[PDB]
Amino acid sequence: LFNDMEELVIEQQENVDVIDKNVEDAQLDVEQGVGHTDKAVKSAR
Amino acid sequence: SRTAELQAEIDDTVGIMRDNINKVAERGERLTSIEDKADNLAVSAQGFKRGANRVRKAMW
Amino acid sequence: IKFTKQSSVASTRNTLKMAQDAERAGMNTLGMLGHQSEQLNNVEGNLDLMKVQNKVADEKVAELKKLEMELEIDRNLDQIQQVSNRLKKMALTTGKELDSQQKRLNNIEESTDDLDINLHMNTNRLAGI
Amino acid sequence: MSDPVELLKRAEKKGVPSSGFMKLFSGSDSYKFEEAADLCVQAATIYRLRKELNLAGDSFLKAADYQKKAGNEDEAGNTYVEAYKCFKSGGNSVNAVDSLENAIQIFTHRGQFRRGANFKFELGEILENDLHDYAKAIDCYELAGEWYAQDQSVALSNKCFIKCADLKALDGQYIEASDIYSKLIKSSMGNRLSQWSLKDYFLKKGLCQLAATDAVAAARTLQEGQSEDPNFADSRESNFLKSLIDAVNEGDSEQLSEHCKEFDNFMRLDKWKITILNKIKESIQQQEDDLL
Amino acid sequence: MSDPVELLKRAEKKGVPSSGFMKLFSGSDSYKFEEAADLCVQAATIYRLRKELNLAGDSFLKAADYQKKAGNEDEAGNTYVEAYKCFKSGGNSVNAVDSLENAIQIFTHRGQFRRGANFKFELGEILENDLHDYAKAIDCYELAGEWYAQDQSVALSNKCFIKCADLKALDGQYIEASDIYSKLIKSSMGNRLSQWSLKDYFLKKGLCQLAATDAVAAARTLQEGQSEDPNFADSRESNFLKSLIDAVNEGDSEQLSEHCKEFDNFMRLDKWKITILNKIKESIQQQEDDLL
């Protein structure tokens, strides 16, 4: 049962890698987007 | 009496760690769902960036 | 009598071996769970920053629209007991750490879903401006 | 709530492409297919709320078809995955298979090998368990493992290749199963985390080689494992495989069955090992029957 | 599907900046590089679909360079990660290293020390296994662990420090490796999850200091382990370290050989410890050479 637990954690490593990478990209993309809306508000005024 | 105590301790760890197996199965299901939703989140963030950029160009 | 003792010695040898190997399995599992805990801490931080950025996005979009054999048996049992104690501590440990990470992963799930919905809303609003 | 039948009828009406003279005055038909898809999605949601799951799957399939006609292939793949979820929860394995095939095609064409591997794996599961189409399941698991290997997913690759090797060995393809086990072994060397699978791996390889009557191959596999993995050298699996090789070389099926019982008492033989071991016994018995 | 070579040629024609008179009438070159990058990415996804990974990685590198020229540094880093993916899956470790270097520089330049540290660790692993660049991999691990300490990630820094000290000790640099083991001891002290790691650390530090002919240093390392860490006090590692210290105090290489044998008897020894202990024995032999 140790072994099965440990193998399930093997599989879950990639889940953790993908969540970190994807949430990072999402955060960065939203930062760029909020910058873009800030510039849009600046121009519209 | 020592060997019996060792046997009891091992049985208890077996029980604790079967519960651990069930918990890590639940954790794996949760992590799969979170992976799917974070792929969704990244796609949505890119779309929001692009739409905000297009609006920025529009008002300029 | 001698044969039975030899069988006991061999069995205690196997028990000690594969017990030690179980110790290893749990150990690397725990180091690995701590690694993934750190990664999930990063995920949580990014989600928090993203919530703040979506508040800013909400307000900006709103304005944008507005605009010898016995002895060996004994010693092998000694070693097995030591390892087994360490194994029990590890099992109680992994149960606890999985519990905390399970609540954390739940909250991560709802936070990601909420951020996704908010971003889709803001993108739909920006499409009409 | 709207009637899903009326939503589907309106979706069908809107989904008719512009033909003839009207094509000179009508804009891109993309837009029309987009609302046909939206109407189909609404009907699918209403069916899903009613637990009329197969109908929801059908509506999602129609929505995905219209999305494909609009050029929105990514949305089409997502909707095929939704149609899949509806069919799988509905017990309609055939339409579930069709949905994943379409979805995986869309995903692979878009360079999303990760998602395509996930769904190819799930498709293989439906083929193994629900439809019992083992051959194309083997194909699914092999290809998913290849896609995972390209992504440097050693682990998901290995899960797929375990399943592929097991199904191949059960189907009489012992040599190819042994070769997949060789690949899996080579991938699991040196990784502290996988050594337990590694012992198992060596055993299975030898067993296939005994089912192919190539006892020399079993011997070299066992020697290899003894040398390259100390944990396997001293393991019950190595000793058991030594013992099976010895029984096979002797032509003593009873000794093999005794060894199987002994190994069973200490480590339960799962169904797969029982099948392969029975095959090995049968090959022995057939050889005596010819020698008699 | 389009021919990827034609896409690359179109990108290359499109990769030429405006020079001279038409620069006065042509807009910013950013759009133009954007088009070239899109073409290269499309060609590279096609290459990836045909399993021609090296060409896909090269096209990723070209697209990343063009995007750097366009000012989209983050997309260039992502494309460098893709080039890494296809190069390492393609077996070209040197080009994967180049992609990792460019990506790490990009990520550090944008304040993403986290990505920098992760990919520095991947880079060091690739160097240790494929290219046997031990010194530069040591630097990679040290820098990764340092940036991880800057990121407050205890576990990542701890792991990177373990491999960093491992490589440093095996390469003759005992004092610095023991110093990193002291850092590992201090960072891991008081944590119940890293207890076992500590149990190993004290021993490793003592071993390294003993390979440096500083017997008093291994003695203080052992005494620190016994007094500070209760579990290590009763651990076989502490007893092995005292017995190593005693044997080298006596200069009895035979006794040392014996203690290696008993330590192997219950806990199979790892190549790191074998190399260090062989170096200690050979130091007894160099001492023997001095002894005349």
PDB file of C-alpha atoms in Angstrom, chain B residues 2-3 5-6 8-10 12-13 16-17 19-21 23-24 26-28 30-31 33-34 37-38 40-45 47-49 51-52 55 58-59, chain C residues 33 36 40 47 50 57 64 67 74 77-78 80-81 84-85 87-88 91-92 94-95 98-99 101-102 105-106 108-109 112-113 115-116 119-120 122-123 126 129:
ATOM      1  CA  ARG B   2       6.983  -7.948  22.400  1.00  0.00           C
ATOM      2  CA  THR B   3       6.187  -9.701  19.121  1.00  0.00           C
ATOM      3  CA  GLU B   5       2.925  -5.568  20.389  1.00  0.00           C
ATOM      4  CA  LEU B   6       4.938  -5.241  17.180  1.00  0.00           C
ATOM      5  CA  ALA B   8      -0.475  -4.733  16.733  1.00  0.00           C
ATOM      6  CA  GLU B   9       1.554  -1.647  15.828  1.00  0.00           C
ATOM      7  CA  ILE B  10       2.033  -2.891  12.269  1.00  0.00           C
ATOM      8  CA  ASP B  12      -2.504  -0.077  13.114  1.00  0.00           C
ATOM      9  CA  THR B  13      -0.078   1.483  10.628  1.00  0.00           C
ATOM     10  CA  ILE B  16      -3.784   4.413   8.989  1.00  0.00           C
ATOM     11  CA  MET B  17      -2.153   4.014   5.622  1.00  0.00           C
ATOM     12  CA  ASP B  19      -6.912   5.493   4.910  1.00  0.00           C
ATOM     13  CA  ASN B  20      -3.962   7.334   3.350  1.00  0.00           C
ATOM     14  CA  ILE B  21      -4.520   5.434   0.082  1.00  0.00           C
ATOM     15  CA  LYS B  23      -7.107  10.103   0.771  1.00  0.00           C
ATOM     16  CA  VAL B  24      -4.506  10.213  -2.010  1.00  0.00           C
ATOM     17  CA  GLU B  26      -9.367  11.667  -3.540  1.00  0.00           C
ATOM     18  CA  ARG B  27      -6.404  14.035  -3.925  1.00  0.00           C
ATOM     19  CA  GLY B  28      -5.644  12.670  -7.394  1.00  0.00           C
ATOM     20  CA  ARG B  30      -9.121  16.758  -7.148  1.00  0.00           C
ATOM     21  CA  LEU B  31      -5.801  17.495  -8.860  1.00  0.00           C
ATOM     22  CA  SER B  33     -10.154  18.581 -11.891  1.00  0.00           C
ATOM     23  CA  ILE B  34      -7.914  21.494 -10.897  1.00  0.00           C
ATOM     24  CA  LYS B  37      -9.921  24.266 -14.589  1.00  0.00           C
ATOM     25  CA  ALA B  38      -6.470  25.871 -14.719  1.00  0.00           C
ATOM     26  CA  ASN B  40      -9.517  26.884 -18.668  1.00  0.00           C
ATOM     27  CA  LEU B  41      -8.104  29.721 -16.547  1.00  0.00           C
ATOM     28  CA  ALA B  42      -5.025  30.168 -18.751  1.00  0.00           C
ATOM     29  CA  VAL B  43      -7.121  30.174 -21.932  1.00  0.00           C
ATOM     30  CA  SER B  44      -9.473  32.740 -20.400  1.00  0.00           C
ATOM     31  CA  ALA B  45      -6.580  34.929 -19.238  1.00  0.00           C
ATOM     32  CA  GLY B  47      -8.481  35.798 -24.189  1.00  0.00           C
ATOM     33  CA  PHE B  48      -8.935  38.636 -21.698  1.00  0.00           C
ATOM     34  CA  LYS B  49      -5.472  39.981 -22.530  1.00  0.00           C
ATOM     35  CA  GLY B  51      -9.652  41.520 -25.850  1.00  0.00           C
ATOM     36  CA  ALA B  52      -8.242  44.248 -23.615  1.00  0.00           C
ATOM     37  CA  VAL B  55     -10.140  47.597 -26.930  1.00  0.00           C
ATOM     38  CA  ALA B  58      -9.970  50.654 -30.632  1.00  0.00           C
ATOM     39  CA  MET B  59     -10.053  53.701 -28.354  1.00  0.00           C
TER      40      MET B  59
ATOM     41  CA  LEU C  33       4.471  16.027  -0.818  1.00  0.00           C
ATOM     42  CA  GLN C  36       4.184  19.837  -4.132  1.00  0.00           C
ATOM     43  CA  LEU C  40       0.681  24.800  -4.379  1.00  0.00           C
ATOM     44  CA  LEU C  47      -4.489  33.151  -7.521  1.00  0.00           C
ATOM     45  CA  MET C  50      -5.114  37.408  -9.859  1.00  0.00           C
ATOM     46  CA  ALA C  57     -10.262  44.821 -14.252  1.00  0.00           C
ATOM     47  CA  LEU C  64     -14.743  51.692 -20.132  1.00  0.00           C
ATOM     48  CA  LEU C  67     -17.323  56.016 -21.671  1.00  0.00           C
ATOM     49  CA  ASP C  74      16.031 -11.039  18.686  1.00  0.00           C
ATOM     50  CA  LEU C  77      12.993  -8.027  15.736  1.00  0.00           C
ATOM     51  CA  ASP C  78      14.753  -5.091  17.441  1.00  0.00           C
ATOM     52  CA  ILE C  80      11.947  -4.278  12.787  1.00  0.00           C
ATOM     53  CA  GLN C  81      10.401  -2.578  15.826  1.00  0.00           C
ATOM     54  CA  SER C  84       7.935   0.036  12.386  1.00  0.00           C
ATOM     55  CA  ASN C  85       7.807   2.899  14.887  1.00  0.00           C
ATOM     56  CA  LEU C  87       6.656   3.780   9.729  1.00  0.00           C
ATOM     57  CA  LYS C  88       3.739   4.496  12.073  1.00  0.00           C
ATOM     58  CA  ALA C  91       1.594   7.034   8.250  1.00  0.00           C
ATOM     59  CA  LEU C  92      -0.007   9.360  10.810  1.00  0.00           C
ATOM     60  CA  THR C  94       0.853  11.429   5.582  1.00  0.00           C
ATOM     61  CA  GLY C  95      -2.755  11.296   6.706  1.00  0.00           C
ATOM     62  CA  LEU C  98      -3.040  14.923   2.875  1.00  0.00           C
ATOM     63  CA  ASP C  99      -5.897  16.352   4.949  1.00  0.00           C
ATOM     64  CA  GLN C 101      -3.545  19.689   1.272  1.00  0.00           C
ATOM     65  CA  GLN C 102      -7.045  18.407   0.501  1.00  0.00           C
ATOM     66  CA  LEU C 105      -6.748  21.963  -3.129  1.00  0.00           C
ATOM     67  CA  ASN C 106     -10.487  22.425  -2.638  1.00  0.00           C
ATOM     68  CA  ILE C 108      -7.741  26.309  -5.057  1.00  0.00           C
ATOM     69  CA  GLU C 109     -10.483  24.699  -7.162  1.00  0.00           C
ATOM     70  CA  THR C 112      -9.712  29.032 -10.087  1.00  0.00           C
ATOM     71  CA  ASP C 113     -13.335  28.564 -11.146  1.00  0.00           C
ATOM     72  CA  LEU C 115     -11.390  33.680 -11.611  1.00  0.00           C
ATOM     73  CA  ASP C 116     -12.300  31.884 -14.844  1.00  0.00           C
ATOM     74  CA  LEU C 119     -12.409  36.704 -16.820  1.00  0.00           C
ATOM     75  CA  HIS C 120     -15.039  35.364 -19.219  1.00  0.00           C
ATOM     76  CA  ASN C 122     -14.877  40.858 -18.542  1.00  0.00           C
ATOM     77  CA  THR C 123     -13.905  39.535 -21.986  1.00  0.00           C
ATOM     78  CA  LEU C 126     -14.809  44.167 -23.673  1.00  0.00           C
ATOM     79  CA  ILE C 129     -16.840  48.166 -26.537  1.00  0.00           C
TER      80      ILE C 129
END
